[PDB]
Subunit: 286 residues, 2 copies
């Protein structure tokens, strides 16, 4: 399932991750029209370009489109799929959804958002949490060897259920707030959690990401559950590791308890994944 | 065809049966609403178990609004569907609904209702047949069709007409599913013509009220300009036929335009159906000649 993405240079990092995570292939990428169109939001010529390309099956614009935009765009594409930020996020929610209640909440938001468009015409369970593009999915895939979003991997002689929960999202549209939390709250069930953090950030950003990640966990009601913090993407660090490791370790234990451990990793390069496996086992045994 | 056990009061029984059967159910057994609803299951536990073990009964239908508590307790026992008035009506709308908006409205309302529940855990004209759930609508549809399909094409001479068994007019609809019903019924506005079925078994004033209400509803849903063929049904059920016929004919022509014709029929006894078919054909001819040069 291919896709054409229209995202700003700033949110492009976020969008690409979300798109790929939604089982979509990023076949094309475009900027944001300085002055968005009134009828189609994107310029008509580009729209026709998307229409005239058998290699594109889904148009994705990382913004909130008005019903008239969907009406006109769909009226032009006639056969291809069109998605905005809200529809994209909802699709992702449904993928990570594990409970029926979550399914319904997600579908409810989708319907409420789609109506106006047609109107105007014992095995332990570990939950991997963190912001998108923190390496979460990559970490999950590296451990599983893989879109299950919930795979039980054998470590030593113990079988462990890994759950790639819905990623933390910044700037969540009010419409899908309920659907999001109901989906994320599925993490409360997990016996333990793996908090994934992007190490590439600076100190000011690391502190923010940590405080935000833990804040969100409090918001859903996570308490007393063992949390293993993994400093991911150490392969793309243009600085020092221990300095950030000690910072993260200290700040985490100040913001939450119990903290099982804090280890640096690299989902892509497999760096320290064997150590992670060991720590996951020690946690499972515990 | 699915079987169902119906719990309903006497005043709503007749309407309940028609609605249930309209949802493709054969009512095998009928009970009245419990004097004092069961705190736990609403329905008497013993009766619930009896229906639970009766393989000749696939679905339980209670013609009343159940509390989320009841749905939960009843469902953990049946393992068989349980339907209250709201879920029943929504299930009925879904069968008629052909538009995406209606489907979504119905589904929305359903997901809504279920949310708390689980949260507490060439040249083919369309002729729509409209009327109340007591006008013998379905019977007429089945007679002209020869029968369930909610839409069915019938051959008349050299023309073939698409008959549409639209959702019946329903009185006292739960506020929760009003939007779902309205949209589903509004689909009748996209028909080229309509057959308004009228229950003749009503008295003088009641008949007028039914007729007036029928046209009023047809107005609310946005029907206008469409030729309407009024059929005074159940003439076999008596005596003052011509009396009520004249009132209907005269009142109808004064209530709406254009009125194609007004004919008396008996869906069950299949009386005057041939004439009806003729009128349908003539109507089809008119519709095909409307925008011609």
């Amino acid at each position: 399932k291919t896709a054409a993405l229209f995202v700003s240079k700033e949110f492009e990092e976020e969008a690409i991750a979300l798109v790929e995570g939604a089982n979509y292939k990023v076949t094309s990428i475009y900027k944001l029209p300085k002055s968005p169109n009134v009828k189609f939001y994107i310029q008509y010529d580009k729209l026709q370009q998307i229409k005239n390309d058998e290699e594109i099956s889904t148009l994705i614009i990382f913004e909130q489109l008005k019903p008239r935009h969907f009406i006109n765009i769909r009226r032009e594409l006639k056969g291809k799929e069109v998605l905005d930020k809200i529809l994209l996020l909802l699709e992702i929610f449904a993928l990570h959804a594990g409970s029926k209640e979550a399914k319904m909440q997600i579908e409810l938001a989708r319907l409420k958002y789609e109506l106006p468009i047609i109107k105007e015409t014992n095995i332990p369970s570990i939950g991997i949490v963190g912001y998108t593009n923190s390496g979460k999915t990559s970490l999950f895939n590296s451990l599983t060897g893989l879109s299950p979003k919930r795979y039980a991997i054998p470590i030593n002689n113990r079988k462990i259920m890994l759950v790639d929960t819905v990623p933390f999202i910044r700037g969540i549209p009010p419409q899908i707030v309920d659907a999001f939390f109901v989906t994320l709250s599925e993490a409360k069930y997990s016996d333990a959690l793996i908090l994934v953090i992007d190490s590439t950030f600076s100190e000011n950003l690391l502190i923010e990401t940590l405080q935000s990640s833990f804040e969100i966990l409090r918001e859903i009601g996570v308490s007393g559950k063992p949390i293993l913090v993994t400093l991911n993407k150490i392969d793309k660090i243009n600085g020092d590791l221990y300095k950030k490791l000690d910072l993260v370790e200290k700040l985490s234990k100040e913001l939450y308890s119990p903290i099982f451990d804090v280890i640096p990793i690299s989902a892509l390069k497999r760096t320290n994944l064997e150590l992670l496996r060991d720590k996951i086992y020690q946690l499972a045994t515990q």
